[PDB]
């Protein structure tokens, strides 16, 4: 029953120990320069944070369970940017998103009810027991195939300000994945 | 000519002539955090910087050639978080609209555009921006609504996101975005 | 058990059997114009008609085999206008996802639950919930007079599947018809 | 000019309703597959002008500008006149809307007019042009068989019988069945 949290943006020196609950298989966020990364959620026992790892050979330390200490990290857009090996030591339903007031970042697993082409996009619609919502996918995430009837896992998707309705677009460091 | 400094940490000095900076503004009233934007240039290419420390800002006066180190690259901009690099030494374009429609990748956007229409949205203000080469939507949510702005003015937009959407592509506003009426 | 009819004039008797018809309703309250919607068939396929003669709903009773004459085709439906155009004689509905799969704008009937309501520019936007997905309903004009709240099941007849850049929606045209169920 | 718009009421219309032929578009094919042909023409009384859809190919010879004609047996629908046959029409002895105005509407119309293109894009199952005007900017959606009309940024499309369309965010111009698109210059 942990609280959401925004790590203040800016540099963060000094040790801050967390518990690393979960993480995603290492993917490529930029296929052009062959740079890779992955995403993980850490937690103290009062609130939980979301982290963006940029060091390929650092996924070893984020095993589910491992209490670890984060230092020299970076905060921006409400997440933790772990960029290099050096600094890691060792020891939402749908209706809700429409009720929101501020662009956040969203994770979750939703059913897909529709798919279609977009201006330069792949527009999906995600079904839910509490309503439905637009998904825009541009850039590199279109490379992931996904069809109506599937269950999509979304991570680091940007809830977007807009006139009509708010929709989940895909930014630079977003990752998509089809679930059984 | 512009360039994306490779994302992640950037130690070591990179010396660049400070081109233009924006007034220091507050991006987060909740914790009362303040910042400003600025543009810097190498001889060939010019970059954009998001400066999160108020004091350092004075040092970003147009003309001062200064040296950057221990900085951070993310989302195609430089993050300066400290007294950090900015050290002294002894001391031209914008982008048209149509090009943004011809964009196939989502950018960050600065510029001067006339406003032609206004209307309220869901939790936001929609402006339309007139131009020699077309027209685009500008979606403003959050704090920047408190910028007064009317039909006929000329807003200056800094660190505005060009947004991936079906149909039209528009300029929304992120956390570090700043608006400024002109004339 | 699905059809369309060539536009233009259509003389001569065309014998059909009425399947279902709606109440007489007023489509233009200002000009106090009235009409009604009915579905007929030739028992290999069915047709959609729009009836502009008020005292003709007598005849379109579900069951009554009738023969149409001097009718008019337009916009993908049959237009019966005056009384002397109807003689007398002696099933496949669409689910939502289907409507997202279309390639070409239809007109649509059907009964769907409502999952959201909100007002848009000059209109009311309803969302309809379905086994096979969810879809938008824009209603502008006089049909806004129809009060509808979340959780109801509206009956929609002669609504238009409408082409849009992101997602297709059903909207109301001049002769559309709305109604709450139960 | 002076002549104002009006909408002929729906239903059958017997009896001669004499009107003067103002303008008219070429004969064009609204269904290329089923090879159905039509054309659009505007006609006016002393006071108002109406929009008529002619389905009889052998009539463009008769909606000549200036020629006063007599409409019997026609049909009203979607605020237009429906000349569907040759017998309907017989001979007798002889404005425009800026874009913003369309944002100002409250009741969905049909729209003719001429506008410059600033953007293009492919949509769900359509093309979305952006139309540019001295008085504003607005969205065109083109679906079905009209996508086969070739138009690109910079051009000026002539559009006739296009439907100004109700939507939540903003209202657009879409292309109904009997619409017609063309390029200029």
XYZ file of C-alpha atoms in Angstrom:
730
model
C 0.000 0.000 0.000
C 2.935 2.226 -0.883
C 2.588 5.852 -1.948
C 3.548 7.200 -5.371
C 6.510 9.572 -5.259
C 8.421 12.129 -7.291
C 12.149 12.259 -6.671
C 13.006 15.940 -6.927
C 14.658 16.822 -10.215
C 18.353 17.688 -10.225
C 21.489 15.809 -9.165
C 21.397 13.634 -6.062
C 24.655 12.853 -4.265
C 24.839 10.814 -1.069
C 23.477 7.305 -0.424
C 19.766 6.571 -0.564
C 18.858 2.938 0.073
C 15.886 1.309 -1.683
C 14.240 -2.045 -2.196
C 14.023 -3.083 -5.814
C 10.743 -4.805 -6.380
C 10.639 -5.265 -10.142
C 12.240 -4.694 -13.523
C 12.016 -5.140 -17.266
C 14.166 -7.020 -19.673
C 16.877 -4.885 -21.163
C 15.725 -3.292 -24.418
C 17.033 -0.804 -26.953
C 15.572 2.688 -26.632
C 17.696 4.053 -29.461
C 18.353 1.593 -32.273
C 20.137 4.297 -34.299
C 23.123 4.654 -31.952
C 22.622 1.133 -30.525
C 22.265 2.560 -27.006
C 20.271 0.358 -24.627
C 18.523 0.767 -21.234
C 15.744 -0.615 -19.041
C 13.122 0.321 -16.417
C 12.693 -0.546 -12.753
C 10.631 0.315 -9.702
C 12.369 0.677 -6.362
C 10.876 1.362 -2.936
C 11.566 2.248 0.655
C 8.878 0.789 2.923
C 6.759 3.951 2.959
C 6.817 5.086 -0.685
C 7.999 3.713 -4.056
C 9.990 5.341 -6.868
C 10.500 4.601 -10.554
C 13.988 4.362 -12.048
C 15.520 4.566 -15.537
C 18.783 2.626 -15.862
C 21.178 3.551 -18.674
C 23.995 1.110 -17.875
C 23.630 -2.212 -19.694
C 25.815 -4.131 -17.240
C 23.893 -2.901 -14.203
C 20.697 -4.965 -14.412
C 22.314 -7.586 -12.189
C 21.857 -5.454 -9.058
C 18.138 -4.735 -9.516
C 17.000 -8.282 -8.720
C 13.576 -8.439 -7.004
C 14.309 -8.371 -3.266
C 17.793 -6.819 -3.227
C 17.877 -3.857 -0.901
C 20.361 -1.574 -2.657
C 21.772 1.924 -2.177
C 21.438 4.571 -4.877
C 23.939 7.406 -5.076
C 25.063 9.966 -7.670
C 21.775 9.472 -9.517
C 19.707 12.005 -11.426
C 16.105 13.143 -11.164
C 14.143 14.418 -14.138
C 10.503 14.228 -15.235
C 9.763 12.419 -11.967
C 12.099 9.460 -12.324
C 15.537 8.210 -11.356
C 18.208 8.294 -14.039
C 20.881 5.750 -13.188
C 23.372 6.281 -15.981
C 26.480 4.332 -14.974
C 27.757 1.336 -12.972
C 29.688 3.481 -10.441
C 26.727 4.782 -8.477
C 24.811 1.616 -7.560
C 26.087 -0.068 -4.414
C 24.833 -3.231 -2.723
C 23.492 -4.300 0.685
C -3.972 2.638 -11.809
C -7.383 1.861 -13.358
C -8.482 3.764 -16.495
C -11.223 6.125 -15.264
C -8.706 7.503 -12.784
C -6.392 8.759 -15.544
C -9.184 10.824 -17.017
C -10.007 12.268 -13.619
C -6.398 13.447 -13.409
C -5.235 17.019 -13.615
C -1.597 16.745 -14.405
C 0.455 14.863 -16.916
C 2.088 11.984 -15.097
C 3.853 8.892 -16.301
C 1.889 5.670 -16.493
C 2.587 1.952 -16.246
C 0.034 -0.856 -16.361
C -1.480 -3.811 -18.176
C -4.524 -3.232 -20.397
C -6.531 -5.196 -22.985
C -6.611 -3.877 -26.553
C -9.935 -3.409 -28.370
C -8.851 -1.462 -31.452
C -5.821 -0.597 -33.518
C -5.252 1.754 -36.456
C -2.748 3.832 -38.395
C -2.013 7.407 -37.519
C -0.416 10.473 -38.936
C 2.917 8.988 -38.152
C 1.524 7.057 -35.340
C 0.062 3.714 -34.342
C -3.114 4.647 -32.463
C -4.481 1.944 -30.124
C -7.488 1.877 -27.877
C -7.189 0.202 -24.515
C -10.165 -1.554 -22.966
C -10.777 -1.672 -19.175
C -13.484 -2.612 -16.654
C -13.635 1.079 -15.801
C -13.609 2.626 -19.277
C -11.426 3.145 -22.329
C -8.640 5.406 -23.520
C -6.564 6.397 -26.534
C -2.948 5.183 -27.004
C -0.587 6.912 -29.406
C 2.615 5.091 -30.361
C 5.189 6.911 -32.454
C 8.885 6.352 -33.074
C 10.634 3.113 -32.246
C 7.870 1.376 -30.333
C 5.861 0.689 -33.516
C 8.404 -2.064 -34.124
C 6.520 -4.054 -31.488
C 3.652 -5.954 -33.018
C 0.437 -5.915 -31.065
C -3.086 -6.866 -32.078
C -6.679 -6.528 -30.863
C -7.376 -9.054 -28.112
C -3.858 -8.912 -26.704
C -2.850 -7.553 -23.299
C -0.266 -4.778 -23.387
C 2.178 -3.924 -20.594
C 2.979 -0.196 -20.757
C 5.935 1.465 -18.986
C 7.070 5.097 -18.979
C 4.120 6.201 -21.095
C 3.290 9.917 -20.977
C -0.300 10.865 -20.003
C -0.932 13.825 -22.273
C -2.616 17.204 -22.055
C -5.050 17.770 -24.931
C -8.391 19.399 -25.807
C -10.528 16.410 -26.879
C -9.366 13.916 -24.287
C -6.144 12.897 -22.663
C -4.198 10.050 -24.243
C -1.149 7.901 -23.439
C 1.575 8.869 -25.939
C 4.995 7.197 -26.211
C 8.123 9.290 -25.506
C 11.811 8.498 -25.975
C 12.281 6.025 -23.132
C 8.948 4.161 -23.351
C 8.647 0.362 -23.603
C 5.836 -1.904 -24.810
C 5.289 -5.626 -24.321
C 2.573 -8.162 -25.086
C 1.342 -10.220 -22.181
C -0.399 -13.594 -21.919
C 23.185 24.160 -36.742
C 21.742 22.186 -33.780
C 22.932 18.990 -32.037
C 21.737 16.551 -29.400
C 24.481 16.043 -26.849
C 24.517 12.301 -26.245
C 22.217 11.433 -23.365
C 23.656 10.485 -19.982
C 26.420 12.163 -17.986
C 28.972 14.497 -19.598
C 32.082 15.113 -17.520
C 34.974 17.144 -18.881
C 35.033 20.725 -20.176
C 33.164 21.760 -23.302
C 33.641 25.466 -24.016
C 30.736 27.295 -25.639
C 29.737 30.897 -26.347
C 26.502 31.782 -24.558
C 23.994 33.000 -27.158
C 20.704 33.870 -25.461
C 19.010 33.156 -22.151
C 15.484 33.486 -20.851
C 14.424 35.255 -17.695
C 14.632 33.061 -14.612
C 11.157 31.682 -13.935
C 9.651 29.227 -11.452
C 8.664 25.860 -12.879
C 7.324 24.323 -9.659
C 5.351 26.437 -7.177
C 4.860 23.455 -4.841
C 8.510 23.294 -3.794
C 9.249 26.797 -5.133
C 11.986 25.521 -7.470
C 13.242 28.013 -10.055
C 15.070 27.760 -13.386
C 15.798 29.333 -16.761
C 16.561 28.363 -20.348
C 19.484 29.370 -22.493
C 21.131 28.706 -25.827
C 24.831 28.135 -26.305
C 26.935 27.651 -29.426
C 30.082 25.904 -30.597
C 31.646 27.263 -33.760
C 29.714 24.831 -35.990
C 26.698 23.916 -33.892
C 24.399 25.497 -31.272
C 22.814 23.682 -28.301
C 20.029 24.336 -25.777
C 20.391 24.273 -21.990
C 17.980 23.957 -19.092
C 19.581 25.680 -16.099
C 18.121 24.605 -12.754
C 20.200 26.887 -10.550
C 19.194 30.487 -10.217
C 22.563 31.850 -9.313
C 24.376 30.266 -12.192
C 21.960 32.018 -14.464
C 23.627 35.442 -14.072
C 26.781 33.892 -15.764
C 24.692 33.094 -18.860
C 24.702 36.681 -20.153
C 24.786 36.815 -23.999
C 28.425 36.984 -25.101
C 30.229 35.394 -22.148
C 32.227 32.462 -23.445
C 32.088 29.862 -20.669
C 33.135 26.243 -20.130
C 30.765 23.408 -19.305
C 31.620 20.233 -17.398
C 29.900 17.711 -15.077
C 26.659 18.458 -16.927
C 23.840 16.186 -18.002
C 22.222 15.380 -21.329
C 18.623 14.172 -21.486
C 15.730 14.767 -23.909
C 18.008 16.648 -26.287
C 19.022 19.349 -23.846
C 21.750 20.076 -21.321
C 21.020 19.896 -17.610
C 23.089 22.152 -15.407
C 22.336 21.514 -11.738
C 25.121 23.330 -9.875
C 27.750 26.073 -9.716
C 29.157 23.048 -11.288
C 30.837 23.772 -14.610
C 29.856 27.301 -15.323
C 33.135 29.149 -15.233
C 34.005 32.388 -16.986
C 36.666 33.008 -19.606
C 37.691 36.453 -20.891
C 34.814 37.809 -22.981
C 21.133 32.727 -36.132
C 17.894 30.797 -36.733
C 14.419 29.746 -35.609
C 12.171 27.005 -37.056
C 9.168 27.443 -39.397
C 5.894 25.562 -38.793
C 5.453 23.305 -41.858
C 8.779 21.620 -41.098
C 7.244 20.419 -37.840
C 4.407 18.764 -39.724
C 7.038 17.242 -41.998
C 8.757 16.054 -38.814
C 8.569 12.277 -38.332
C 10.108 12.319 -34.890
C 9.017 14.145 -31.748
C 11.227 17.157 -30.883
C 11.445 19.982 -28.365
C 10.472 23.410 -29.699
C 11.414 27.083 -29.213
C 10.149 29.990 -31.297
C 8.175 33.127 -32.097
C 4.677 32.702 -33.538
C 1.581 34.917 -33.888
C -1.648 33.738 -32.249
C -4.874 33.636 -34.274
C -7.390 31.739 -32.139
C -8.012 30.761 -28.542
C -10.388 28.408 -26.767
C -10.660 26.414 -23.565
C -10.107 22.651 -23.590
C -10.447 19.801 -21.100
C -8.019 21.081 -18.480
C -6.055 23.325 -20.766
C -5.977 26.270 -23.137
C -5.758 25.727 -26.885
C -4.094 28.425 -28.923
C -3.657 28.352 -32.668
C -0.506 29.787 -34.206
C -0.597 31.615 -37.542
C 2.428 31.491 -39.888
C 3.659 32.015 -43.478
C 3.919 28.267 -43.889
C 0.842 26.966 -42.101
C -0.802 26.652 -38.709
C -0.489 24.426 -35.657
C -2.153 23.792 -32.314
C -0.586 24.753 -28.987
C -1.937 22.897 -25.953
C -1.181 24.562 -22.599
C -1.908 22.727 -19.362
C -0.756 23.220 -15.775
C 0.907 26.412 -14.615
C 1.457 28.159 -17.938
C -2.287 28.848 -18.208
C -1.628 31.715 -15.798
C 0.195 33.497 -18.622
C -2.267 35.961 -20.019
C -2.452 35.631 -23.800
C -4.850 36.880 -26.488
C -5.605 36.835 -30.214
C -3.146 39.084 -32.020
C -0.242 38.662 -29.591
C 3.038 36.934 -30.314
C 3.996 34.304 -27.768
C 7.534 33.078 -27.411
C 7.660 29.373 -26.624
C 10.640 27.651 -25.031
C 11.036 23.926 -24.340
C 7.654 23.057 -25.854
C 7.111 19.471 -26.974
C 6.139 18.555 -30.538
C 3.659 15.814 -29.801
C 3.032 12.476 -31.515
C -0.660 12.189 -32.203
C -2.946 10.767 -34.819
C -4.105 13.456 -37.158
C -2.468 16.799 -36.369
C 0.728 17.297 -34.466
C 0.695 20.035 -31.847
C 2.894 21.819 -29.320
C 1.934 20.780 -25.762
C 3.722 21.987 -22.619
C 5.960 19.874 -20.335
C 7.285 20.610 -16.835
C 10.085 22.928 -17.908
C 8.114 24.873 -20.475
C 7.875 28.660 -20.415
C 5.600 31.116 -22.198
C 6.140 34.822 -22.918
C 4.001 37.449 -24.694
C 5.762 39.956 -27.000
C 5.021 43.414 -28.528
C -29.822 -10.775 -44.585
C -28.275 -7.374 -45.299
C -28.802 -5.022 -48.317
C -28.657 -1.556 -49.930
C -30.716 0.136 -52.719
C -29.764 2.192 -55.777
C -30.267 5.931 -55.448
C -32.628 7.755 -57.778
C -36.331 7.262 -58.402
C -37.953 3.827 -57.991
C -41.394 3.313 -59.571
C -43.215 0.008 -59.731
C -44.242 -2.210 -56.817
C -41.419 -3.707 -54.769
C -42.965 -6.243 -52.432
C -41.416 -6.478 -48.974
C -42.325 -7.649 -45.478
C -41.960 -5.146 -42.636
C -39.652 -6.387 -39.887
C -39.511 -3.610 -37.328
C -40.450 0.052 -37.058
C -39.942 2.871 -34.579
C -42.503 5.214 -33.001
C -43.456 8.288 -34.949
C -41.090 10.969 -33.724
C -40.415 14.625 -34.411
C -37.086 15.268 -36.116
C -37.419 19.031 -36.438
C -39.336 20.415 -33.478
C -38.963 23.964 -34.779
C -40.660 23.242 -38.095
C -42.650 20.522 -36.291
C -41.706 17.940 -38.918
C -42.401 14.270 -38.199
C -41.218 10.905 -39.540
C -40.390 7.336 -38.571
C -37.886 4.563 -39.147
C -38.703 1.038 -40.334
C -36.894 -2.098 -41.503
C -38.399 -4.283 -44.237
C -37.149 -7.394 -46.057
C -37.600 -9.649 -49.107
C -36.658 -12.597 -46.915
C -33.271 -13.101 -48.563
C -32.159 -9.669 -47.368
C -33.546 -6.593 -45.561
C -33.828 -2.854 -46.355
C -33.855 0.401 -44.416
C -36.594 2.975 -44.938
C -37.275 6.500 -43.638
C -40.987 7.366 -43.624
C -42.065 10.994 -43.910
C -45.829 10.440 -44.056
C -47.246 10.494 -40.529
C -50.471 8.558 -41.191
C -48.640 5.659 -42.828
C -47.288 4.000 -39.682
C -50.662 2.272 -39.614
C -49.414 0.016 -42.384
C -45.801 -0.752 -41.371
C -46.859 -3.112 -38.578
C -44.292 -5.851 -37.838
C -45.640 -8.778 -39.846
C -47.575 -6.953 -42.566
C -46.382 -7.832 -46.068
C -46.523 -4.619 -48.110
C -45.497 -3.469 -51.544
C -43.667 -0.205 -52.035
C -44.201 2.025 -55.054
C -42.878 5.399 -56.230
C -40.220 5.408 -53.515
C -36.868 7.158 -53.570
C -33.322 6.020 -52.929
C -30.750 8.268 -51.296
C -27.838 8.241 -48.839
C -28.023 4.447 -48.603
C -31.682 4.248 -47.560
C -35.285 4.178 -48.871
C -37.355 7.331 -48.841
C -41.100 6.864 -48.709
C -42.642 10.322 -48.691
C -46.362 10.329 -49.532
C -49.340 8.062 -48.724
C -50.029 6.824 -52.296
C -46.652 5.158 -52.354
C -47.574 2.209 -50.174
C -49.910 -0.592 -51.103
C -50.898 -3.498 -48.908
C -50.869 -7.261 -49.407
C -53.049 -10.210 -48.413
C -31.868 -9.837 -37.662
C -28.205 -9.266 -38.513
C -27.065 -6.527 -36.149
C -23.555 -5.065 -35.835
C -21.275 -5.262 -32.797
C -18.831 -2.442 -32.028
C -15.367 -3.707 -33.063
C -16.942 -4.432 -36.422
C -17.519 -0.668 -36.791
C -13.837 0.000 -36.184
C -13.025 -2.541 -38.874
C -15.122 -0.867 -41.575
C -13.322 0.842 -44.449
C -16.222 2.983 -45.552
C -18.654 5.137 -43.645
C -22.007 3.452 -42.884
C -25.262 4.377 -41.220
C -25.885 2.450 -38.038
C -28.612 1.190 -35.721
C -28.122 -0.747 -32.517
C -28.541 -0.684 -28.761
C -25.552 -0.092 -26.581
C -24.963 0.693 -22.911
C -23.557 4.121 -22.055
C -20.341 4.221 -20.048
C -19.517 7.934 -20.037
C -21.085 11.316 -20.765
C -19.414 14.674 -21.347
C -20.195 17.792 -23.340
C -18.053 18.838 -26.266
C -18.071 21.771 -28.686
C -21.766 22.380 -29.406
C -22.582 18.777 -28.732
C -22.911 15.984 -26.231
C -20.437 13.108 -26.360
C -21.494 9.720 -25.110
C -19.271 6.684 -24.833
C -20.803 3.304 -25.481
C -19.576 0.110 -23.827
C -19.591 -3.256 -25.589
C -18.373 -6.831 -25.288
C -16.362 -6.118 -28.373
C -15.060 -2.695 -27.377
C -16.004 0.940 -26.917
C -16.887 3.760 -29.254
C -17.734 7.450 -29.264
C -21.169 9.017 -29.892
C -21.338 12.685 -30.897
C -24.784 14.229 -30.907
C -25.183 17.795 -32.085
C -28.356 19.644 -32.996
C -31.869 18.883 -31.818
C -31.186 15.364 -30.577
C -29.387 16.955 -27.625
C -32.954 17.371 -26.346
C -32.852 13.669 -25.516
C -31.788 13.347 -21.919
C -29.422 10.442 -21.419
C -27.265 9.625 -18.383
C -24.479 7.101 -17.667
C -25.520 3.473 -17.260
C -28.534 3.612 -19.566
C -28.987 1.703 -22.776
C -29.777 4.072 -25.624
C -31.380 2.826 -28.801
C -29.802 4.554 -31.775
C -31.250 4.331 -35.269
C -30.075 6.026 -38.496
C -26.824 7.240 -36.912
C -23.780 7.756 -39.124
C -20.480 5.919 -38.830
C -18.161 8.892 -39.367
C -14.638 9.079 -40.773
C -12.078 10.676 -38.468
C -8.260 10.882 -38.398
C -7.811 8.915 -35.210
C -10.869 6.919 -34.337
C -14.190 6.557 -36.068
C -17.389 7.617 -34.295
C -21.161 7.446 -34.654
C -22.851 10.833 -34.982
C -26.397 12.091 -35.455
C -27.725 13.515 -38.744
C -31.001 15.259 -39.554
C -33.063 12.108 -39.475
C -31.261 10.329 -36.644
C -33.189 8.965 -33.670
C -32.297 8.435 -30.007
C -34.100 6.641 -27.192
C -33.519 5.347 -23.688
C -34.385 1.710 -22.914
C -36.218 0.101 -19.952
C -23.719 39.563 -53.320
C -27.323 39.755 -52.106
C -28.904 36.317 -52.552
C -28.942 34.454 -49.248
C -28.825 30.727 -48.497
C -31.858 28.608 -47.760
C -32.754 24.953 -47.284
C -35.611 23.389 -49.260
C -37.710 21.326 -46.875
C -37.650 17.547 -47.127
C -40.248 15.425 -48.916
C -41.595 15.343 -52.462
C -42.101 18.619 -54.346
C -44.648 18.580 -57.193
C -45.544 21.711 -59.164
C -43.183 24.100 -60.922
C -40.820 25.998 -58.638
C -39.113 28.344 -61.111
C -35.545 29.434 -60.294
C -32.516 30.986 -62.042
C -29.339 28.945 -62.635
C -26.346 30.625 -61.004
C -23.451 28.158 -61.065
C -22.808 24.449 -61.636
C -19.902 22.017 -61.585
C -18.854 19.645 -64.358
C -20.395 16.225 -64.695
C -18.399 13.924 -62.411
C -18.527 10.354 -61.153
C -19.591 9.916 -57.530
C -19.366 6.142 -57.663
C -16.558 4.980 -59.963
C -17.210 1.304 -59.191
C -20.980 1.332 -59.865
C -20.368 3.986 -62.571
C -22.982 6.422 -61.258
C -22.698 10.020 -62.411
C -23.972 13.342 -61.092
C -23.165 17.017 -60.872
C -23.823 19.940 -58.582
C -25.478 23.237 -59.463
C -26.701 26.306 -57.627
C -29.961 28.056 -58.474
C -31.709 31.088 -57.070
C -35.009 32.882 -56.728
C -35.230 36.608 -56.406
C -34.194 36.400 -52.786
C -32.491 33.163 -51.842
C -30.262 30.591 -53.507
C -30.478 26.815 -53.096
C -28.139 23.875 -53.678
C -29.245 21.058 -55.968
C -27.841 17.582 -56.703
C -28.572 16.495 -60.299
C -28.461 12.751 -60.957
C -29.456 12.978 -64.606
C -26.426 13.248 -66.878
C -28.542 14.638 -69.713
C -29.138 17.863 -67.810
C -25.818 19.739 -67.534
C -26.846 20.997 -70.962
C -29.712 22.716 -69.111
C -28.268 24.311 -65.921
C -26.475 26.894 -68.034
C -25.682 30.124 -66.101
C -28.456 32.699 -66.639
C -30.996 30.234 -68.054
C -34.246 30.364 -66.071
C -35.664 26.870 -65.466
C -38.648 25.155 -63.855
C -38.315 22.429 -61.244
C -41.298 20.085 -61.015
C -41.452 16.694 -59.262
C -38.165 17.167 -57.365
C -37.228 15.937 -53.907
C -36.035 17.547 -50.717
C -33.434 15.989 -48.480
C -30.464 17.263 -46.448
C -31.577 20.784 -47.319
C -30.934 20.183 -50.982
C -32.871 19.600 -54.166
C -32.731 16.177 -55.750
C -33.222 16.129 -59.489
C -33.152 12.414 -60.138
C -34.744 12.235 -63.591
C -35.060 14.142 -66.884
C -38.843 14.689 -66.642
C -38.373 16.876 -63.588
C -36.890 19.839 -65.355
C -38.171 22.121 -68.066
C -37.015 25.342 -69.731
C -38.520 28.856 -69.598
C -38.069 32.147 -71.477
C -35.216 34.321 -70.179
C -22.037 34.520 -51.652
C -19.365 32.360 -50.003
C -18.209 31.379 -46.509
C -14.890 32.225 -44.871
C -13.371 29.552 -42.609
C -13.883 31.019 -39.110
C -17.619 31.358 -39.881
C -17.650 27.563 -39.918
C -16.177 27.484 -36.431
C -18.990 29.865 -35.522
C -21.791 27.520 -36.649
C -23.922 25.491 -34.196
C -25.721 23.372 -36.725
C -23.944 21.167 -39.189
C -24.137 22.305 -42.819
C -22.865 21.298 -46.232
C -20.083 23.462 -47.537
C -18.671 24.463 -50.872
C -15.737 26.810 -51.208
C -12.087 27.198 -52.114
C -9.106 27.041 -49.756
C -5.322 26.635 -49.792
C -3.656 23.499 -48.383
C -0.942 23.797 -45.695
C -0.568 20.239 -44.388
C -1.486 16.734 -45.493
C -1.509 13.444 -43.609
C -2.968 9.971 -43.748
C -5.456 9.166 -41.025
C -7.328 6.090 -39.860
C -8.870 5.219 -43.214
C -8.622 8.607 -44.807
C -6.606 11.673 -45.738
C -6.585 14.785 -43.590
C -5.742 17.938 -45.357
C -5.282 21.194 -43.475
C -6.984 24.182 -45.035
C -5.478 27.644 -44.734
C -7.477 30.886 -44.889
C -7.203 34.622 -44.285
C -9.608 34.057 -41.430
C -8.434 30.786 -39.958
C -7.529 27.157 -40.263
C -9.625 24.023 -40.286
C -9.500 20.265 -40.869
C -10.662 18.350 -43.954
C -11.273 14.594 -43.775
C -11.499 12.647 -47.039
C -12.685 9.048 -46.961
C -14.011 6.513 -49.449
C -13.499 7.107 -53.157
C -12.326 10.706 -52.970
C -8.931 9.772 -51.602
C -8.355 8.942 -55.268
C -8.337 12.692 -55.911
C -4.715 13.775 -55.985
C -3.911 16.823 -53.857
C -0.768 18.017 -52.102
C 0.469 20.897 -49.897
C 0.492 24.285 -51.622
C -2.425 23.536 -53.944
C -5.871 25.053 -53.861
C -8.669 22.532 -53.767
C -12.169 23.417 -54.870
C -14.534 21.489 -52.640
C -18.270 21.213 -53.157
C -20.940 19.475 -51.038
C -18.571 18.883 -48.128
C -20.129 18.319 -44.711
C -19.077 20.639 -41.875
C -19.053 17.977 -39.166
C -19.917 17.829 -35.462
C -17.047 16.742 -33.163
C -16.048 17.308 -29.519
C -12.565 18.814 -29.967
C -13.253 20.857 -33.073
C -15.599 20.568 -36.050
C -14.161 19.360 -39.371
C -15.034 19.139 -43.027
C -15.591 15.505 -44.020
C -16.579 14.023 -47.390
C -20.090 12.566 -47.643
C -21.312 10.308 -50.475
C -22.108 12.942 -53.083
C -19.115 15.170 -52.429
C -16.657 16.519 -55.001
C -13.016 17.570 -54.863
C -10.814 19.290 -57.393
C -7.485 21.087 -57.716
C -6.943 24.651 -58.961
C -4.222 26.072 -61.264
